Design a protein around this ligand. Structure first.
Ligand SMILES: Nc1nc2c(ncn2[C@@H]2O[C@H](COP(=O)(O)OP(=O)(O)OP(=O)(O)O)[C@@H](O)[C@H]2O)c(=O)[nH]1
Ligand SMILES: *[C@]12O[C@@]3(C)CC[C@H](OC(=O)[C@@H]1[C@H]1[C@@H]4[C@H]5[C@H](O)[C@@H](C)[C@H](O)[C@@H]5C=C(C)[C@@H]4C[C@H]13)[C@H]2C
Ligand SMILES: Nc1nc2c(ncn2[C@@H]2O[C@H](COP(=O)(O)OP(=O)(O)O)[C@@H](O)[C@H]2O)c(=O)[nH]1
Ligand SMILES: [Ca+2]
Ligand SMILES: [Mg+2]
Ligand SMILES: [Mg+2]
Lengths: 440, 421, 71
């Protein structure tokens, strides 16, 4: 019951999936061969961690996950890597030719050749669920597969699973590690196409994560490995309510109730703390008050934007580790006085708190220090629209000259799809303005 | 594997092609007998891009050698890496092209093209996932220019959804005194604008000037010029041949470099000809360009930069930012983030560090304006036209070629002058 | 009240089914439009290439006449 299926699409989605599932295994005590000595019910059960892992009669704990990519080389590393025994071969799906950073090839030319097989593989995971809750979809905005194939898959999932909830973790592009000039095109195309098919999407700005690694972990030139280990801690914080249980645990769907006031306004801003190196953590124990204060430092946000210049429609605090309500309440009171969080006038101003007592975990050989307590803030702020505005501006500069558009038209797309997507983004930006205006 | 099929046509094409295979064979640890004798697994990671794997652990360049006379290929076969090429991939005629684009494209070349296609088909049919083709040739001769562009059109008919990439050697009076080179070059460019996805403009004018001015060679030889060409070709194919994130195959390269289908003529560059700041500054200096064009006479649509060797990635990132910021006027503002940078740990032979530059600059119009000026100077007096009409050509085809190349110049100027506001 | 309760749940069923139906139809129209557009572009490319081959025939037929007619 309450199973969740994860779908990792394209290089970014797959490599972030690698990091997440490795971290889940460490959190739950699951070995690389899938054995979990602590689980005394063999071949099944309804424990919290069973939302993310099925079980075989031989005691293997198998991620409820599909990895899909239109070329083989990234998923091939999963097939030969440390956690290869974790997955059945059928969960790792690859084509031979990728989308060449082209939404049109991911959604149409190449993607259409593998979509039926992917849905078939997803259906086999669903059929093993007694109460499937929904999907978690990991992908880049910028790649041809992450953009085009994800939108195709999300459309097909709406048809095949109705209004079953679909959540996204979406990698927003940054020039420091981007690989295509057309990533603004792919980003707008997929955001337009997926908007009505996604219930909630957590954008991760690669530049925000890059800056955090540089500034907080003293990493000179962060790699995807550096970025993905930090991303997995945020993902783990968000999903920990699904995988563990406890008295103070609050289900992600309960936060979602507060986070999504209108169907299109479904893009929470995540902020995570503490991100500190072993060298700095050695001296200092970071208290509940300290990590809570850090949640309101813009430098710790997963998306670059200024919430001080916007209005809040929700604020959720997801704590994990050595944390008790008394300290949270005190920390929040201090922040209410010294910070002037401004809410829109139509929603309550309380902060919604959950606590998972399971302590945070780190992967061996990483840069993050192991800490006794951590927190992920999820806020619904009008400021997140600033991320759309930066993308829309880059889209506009190129599209005015129709630069690179022939690559999409050559694959069967029409200019009408670009303007339709951009108009949808203009309406979304307008939506975020409207919800921030005071009532009558 | 994403295989590339290599074709080299004519004297220049086979000469440049042979050196290319010598250089990258050395880089991948392949010896003249086809056996691997390297030290790093990175050398074999993507070896299938350019080599077939035969029994006995033999690596055979996926390469086809075309020419209408036997001479050049005979010396290739007895060259350094002659025995490495597949004997059956040599396709040569006898009549020769006589430096006549019409003979290469319409007559002698047309009688041989079917034989070449048979070899292309056999190489492509055993490809796991064919990327496309790369052609080496000159534009000033007869076989490489005329038959080379014919091969492109015929291949495109059978592989219309594959990338076509050429290394095209532009003629200069400083290297060859053959008078009808501007005719052959203009007729060839007429084809390249329509039927290739990306063309590296290897300009003998720039190669001579580099050797004479910079390297101080009073009398540069084709060997000297080809040293520059092979080092450049190695550089611009590094991202295709080694594991990496950026421009790792022909199609992603084109998607990053070609904002409008006709503007696909690249200005390559190489440094050095040493610190990371100096390497980047050199890389953007006109003296280091393999096309005789000054980038400060135009604006960059897109740029690819490849650094090779052990160096600070942080410093490369800072210096590439610094160069763009201080030269912002020369990068079109309506293509954000149009300069992409890749780093390869493996340096080229004989250097601790190197940089290779691929620019899509509107200043490439200077190259075409030079060819056009020489073309019209001969065409205004209908000089030497009988060599071409004698093959069946009508002078209207010359007018259309001239016109199409003039339109290309106007097109590069349109986007040079375009503004964001 | 019972009849209203029935109308609420059948309204929810109707809306979900119309959402599924509309997504299915839009996707079919998109995939067929794209398929037709790409096929047309490939056809135009080959037709131009075929025009070149026709022109090649006229060229060789022009040399044939020049040579035999004059000699
Ligand atoms: N955070 C993070 N970002 C990544 C990673 N890999 C790629 N990206 C980003 O994703 C975007 C490129 O998309 P990819 O996921 O690599 O492309 P793809 O989905 O495989 O699509 P195609 O390769 O075009 O078929 C760029 O913005 C990259 O910076 C990763 O491992 N972690
Ligand atoms: C090649 O080109 C030159 C321009 C420099 C860059 C690269 O490194 C080289 O080693 C090589 C050089 C060659 C000269 C050698 O230094 C020397 C033995 C002799 O003068 C060689 C002759 C040349 C034409 C090359 C000039 C250097 C290479 C791409
Ligand atoms: N850089 C360089 N240019 C060459 C070489 N061989 C020929 N060329 C140039 O190619 C043009 C002549 O074309 P060529 O290849 O000889 O005619 P083809 O054999 O009929 O294709 C002239 O502009 C020459 O300068 C070479 O090895 N290197
Ligand atoms: Ca169990
Ligand atoms: Mg990919
Ligand atoms: Mg010659």
């Amino acid at each position: 019951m309450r199973e969740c299926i994860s779908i990792h699409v394209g290089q970014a989605g797959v490599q972030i999936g690698n990091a997440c599932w490795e971290l889940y295994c460490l959190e739950h005590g699951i070995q690389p061969d899938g054995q979990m000595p602590s689980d005394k019910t063999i071949g099944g059960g309804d424990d919290s961690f069973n939302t993310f892992f099925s079980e075989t009669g031989a005691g293997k704990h198998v991620p409820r996950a599909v990895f899909v990519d239109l070329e083989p080389t990234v998923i091939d590393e999963v097939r030969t890597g440390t956690y290869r025994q974790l997955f059945h071969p059928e969960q790792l799906i690859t084509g031979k030719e990728d989308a060449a950073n082209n939404y049109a090839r991911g959604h149409y030319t190449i993607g259409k050749e593998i979509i039926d097989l992917v849905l078939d593989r997803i259906r086999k995971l669903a059929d093993q669920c007694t109460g499937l809750q929904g999907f978690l979809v990991f992908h880049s905005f910028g790649g041809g597969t992450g953009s085009g194939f994800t939108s195709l898959l999300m459309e097909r999932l709406s048809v095949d699973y109705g209004k079953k909830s679909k959540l996204e973790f979406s990698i927003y592009p940054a020039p420091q590690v981007s690989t295509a000039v057309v990533e603004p095109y792919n980003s707008i195309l997929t955001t337009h196409t997926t908007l009505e098919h996604s219930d909630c999407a957590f954008m991760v700005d690669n530049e925000a994560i890059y800056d955090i690694c540089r500034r907080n972990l003293d990493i000179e030139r962060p790699t995807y490995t550096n970025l993905n280990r930090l991303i997995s801690q945020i993902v783990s914080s968000i999903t920990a309510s699904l995988r563990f249980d406890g008295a103070l645990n609050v289900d992600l769907t309960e936060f979602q109730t507060n986070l999504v006031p209108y169907p299109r306004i479904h893009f929470p801003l995540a902020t995570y703390a503490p991100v500190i190196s072993a060298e700095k953590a050695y001296h200092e124990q970071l208290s509940v008050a300290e990590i809570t204060n850090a949640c309101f430092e813009p430098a710790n946000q997963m998306v670059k934007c200024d919430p001080r210049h916007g209005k809040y429609m929700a604020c959720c605090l997801l704590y994990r580790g050595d944390v008790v309500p008394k300290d949270v309440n005190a920390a929040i009171a201090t922040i209410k006085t010294k910070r002037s969080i401004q809410f829109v006038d139509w929603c309550p101003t309380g902060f919604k708190v959950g606590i998972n007592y399971q302590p945070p975990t780190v992967v061996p050989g990483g840069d993050l220090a192991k800490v006794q307590r951590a927190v992920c803030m999820l806020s619904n702020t009008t400021a997140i629209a600033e991320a759309w505005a930066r993308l829309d501006h880059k889209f506009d500069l190129m599209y005015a000259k129709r630069a690179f558009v022939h690559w999409y038209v050559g694959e069967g797309m029409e200019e009408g799809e670009f303007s339709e997507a951009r108009e949808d983004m203009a309406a979304l930006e307008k939506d975020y303005e409207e919800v921030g205006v005071d009532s009558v | 594997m994403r295989e590339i099929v290599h074709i080299q046509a004519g004297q220049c094409g086979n000469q440049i092609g042979a050196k290319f295979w010598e250089v990258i064979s050395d880089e991948h640890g392949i010896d003249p007998t086809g056996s691997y004798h390297g030290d790093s697994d990175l050398q074999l990671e993507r070896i299938n891009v350019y080599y077939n794997e035969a029994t006995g652990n033999k690596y055979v360049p996926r390469a086809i050698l075309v020419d209408l006379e036997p001479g050049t290929m005979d010396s290739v076969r007895s060259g350094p890496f002659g025995q490495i090429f597949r004997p059956d991939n040599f396709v040569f005629g006898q009549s020769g092209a006589g430096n006549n684009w019409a003979k290469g494209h319409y007559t002698e070349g047309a009688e041989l093209v079917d034989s070449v296609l048979d070899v292309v088909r056999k190489e492509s049919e055993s490809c796991d996932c064919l990327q496309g083709f790369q052609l080496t040739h000159s534009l000033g001769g007869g076989t490489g220019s005329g038959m080379g562009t014919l091969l492109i059109s015929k291949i495109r008919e059978e592989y219309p959804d594959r990338i076509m990439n050429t290394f095209s050697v532009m003629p200069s009076p400083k290297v060859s005194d053959t008078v009808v080179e501007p005719y052959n070059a203009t007729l060839s460019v007429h084809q390249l604008v329509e039927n290739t996805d990306e063309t590296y403009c290897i300009d003998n004018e720039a190669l001579y000037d580099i050797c004479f001015r910079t390297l101080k060679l009073t009398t540069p030889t084709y060997g000297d010029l080809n040293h520059l060409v092979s080092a450049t070709m190695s550089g611009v194919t590094t991202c295709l041949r080694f594991p990496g994130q950026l421009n790792a195959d022909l199609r992603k390269l084109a998607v990053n470099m070609v904002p409008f289908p006709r503007l696909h003529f690249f200005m390559p560059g190489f440094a050095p000809l040493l610190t990371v700041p100096e390497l980047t500054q050199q890389m953007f200096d006109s003296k280091n360009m393999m096309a005789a064009c000054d980038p400060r006479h135009g604006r960059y649509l897109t740029v690819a930069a490849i650094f090779r060797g052990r160096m600070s990635m942080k410093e490369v990132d800072e210096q590439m930012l610094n160069v763009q910021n201080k030269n912002s006027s020369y990068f079109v503002e309506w293509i954000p983030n149009n300069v992409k940078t890749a780093v390869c740990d493996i340096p080229p032979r004989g250097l601790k560090m190197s940089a290779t530059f691929i620019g899509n600059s509107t200043a490439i119009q200077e190259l075409f304006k030079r060819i056009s000026e020489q073309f019209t100077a001969m065409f205004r007096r209908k000089a030497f036209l009988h060599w071409y009409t004698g093959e069946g050509m009508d002078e209207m085809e010359f007018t259309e070629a001239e016109s199409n190349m003039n339109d290309l110049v106007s097109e590069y100027q349109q986007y040079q002058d375009a503004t964001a506001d | 009240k019972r009849e209203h309760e029935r109308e609420v749940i059948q309204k929810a069923i109707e809306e979900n089914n119309n959402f599924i139906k509309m997504a299915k139809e839009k996707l079919a129209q998109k995939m067929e439009s794209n398929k037709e557009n790409r096929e047309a572009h490939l056809a135009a490319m080959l037709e131009r290439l075929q025009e070149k081959d026709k022109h090649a025939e006229e060229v060789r037929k022009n040399k044939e006449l020049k040579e035999e007619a004059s000699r």
